[PDB]
Amino acid sequence: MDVPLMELSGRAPVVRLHDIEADMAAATDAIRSQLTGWGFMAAEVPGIGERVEAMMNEFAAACRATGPSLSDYAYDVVPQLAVGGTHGFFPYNSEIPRLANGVPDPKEFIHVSGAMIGDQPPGAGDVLRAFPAFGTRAAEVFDIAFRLISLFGEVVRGMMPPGTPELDLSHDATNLRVIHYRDVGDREVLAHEHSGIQMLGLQLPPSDQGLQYVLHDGTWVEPVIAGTDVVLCNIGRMLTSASDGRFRPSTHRVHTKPMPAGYERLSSVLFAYPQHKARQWKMVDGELMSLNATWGDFIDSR
Ligand SMILES: [Cl-]
Ligand SMILES: [Fe+2]
């Protein structure tokens, strides 16, 4: 094939959730080598695959439900933070599609923010009350993902100059995206090459192969992650900026093969953000430069 498989199961460092700090400390030298060698990071987290599979299966069931209805919790009827991104359900619109950088987006998806988990603003939690099986599992997977991604952030911070501050990822600003690809038709590409705007992304094991990453030399590879306990950690463009371009964004894409009549591909990813209101910073010429612009301004800039 043009794109080789990249085996990680039995190869990436093992990080037990009941043991996450000690195991991330032990894994740190290997994870640094991944970021340097590949441009993205990986850990095997025993048991995470079945927790994520269960959560995504409840999301799929919530997408098919005829009362309550996930469409009743579309982002345009969900209370939104005054300062923040948009949480709630993003329906697939077959007449005027949502565009991902100009390209129709073949999915319906939900953003479960740390704010939403806490019912912030009041009523944002309504979807988690309407679909409690999903809601409990989404909060479970959000929390596991936020603990893992926070410790990947410490690995990256550790590689940067002394004086690099804590990334200070914001629980409430951080979003778990849960995806149900649909209306795929003859598409081979579900998502063209891109990176996340935010600090870090944590790719949880998807239902199907097809997520691909580019290596430093421009070689595209396909991590073996479907059905696994492997998580991938992505550099987002806020950290590329904070690092003065040392760590490029972990550019990736999603391809697929033909699958049965409306076979349900599912995927979930944690997007970790700092506080929108907080000032930017960058490590420039070996030490911290404080910026006037905020992390919110960074997002608005694009
Ligand atoms: Cl992304
Ligand atoms: Fe992505």
Resolution in A: 1.8
CA 19, distance to chain mean position in Å, is: 22
Separation of alpha carbons 221 and 229, rounded Å: 19
Show the beta-strand stretches assigned E in 56-169.
Answer: 88-90, 99-100, 103-104, 107-113
Quote the CA–CA distance of 145 and 232 in Å, as a whole number.
11
Question: Which one of the ligands is nearest to 199 CA?
Answer: 1
Go through the domains of the chain in sequence order and give each one's CATH number: 5-301 (2.60.120.330)
CB 252 within 8 A of CB 196: no
Binding site: residue ranges?
A: 177, 181, 194, 252, 265, 267
CA-to-CA distance for 4 and 39, rounded, in angstroms? 17
Give CA–CA dist 178/269, Å, rounded.
Answer: 7
Ligand 2 centroid vs 269 CA: distance in angstroms?
A: 8
Q: How far is the CA of 38 from the centre of ligand 1 (A)?
A: 17
Task: Report residues near ion ligand 1: CB below 5 Å.
Answer: 196
As a whole number of angstroms, the longest Cα–Cα distance in the chain is 57
Burial of 175 (0-12, 13-18, 19+ CB in 10 A): buried
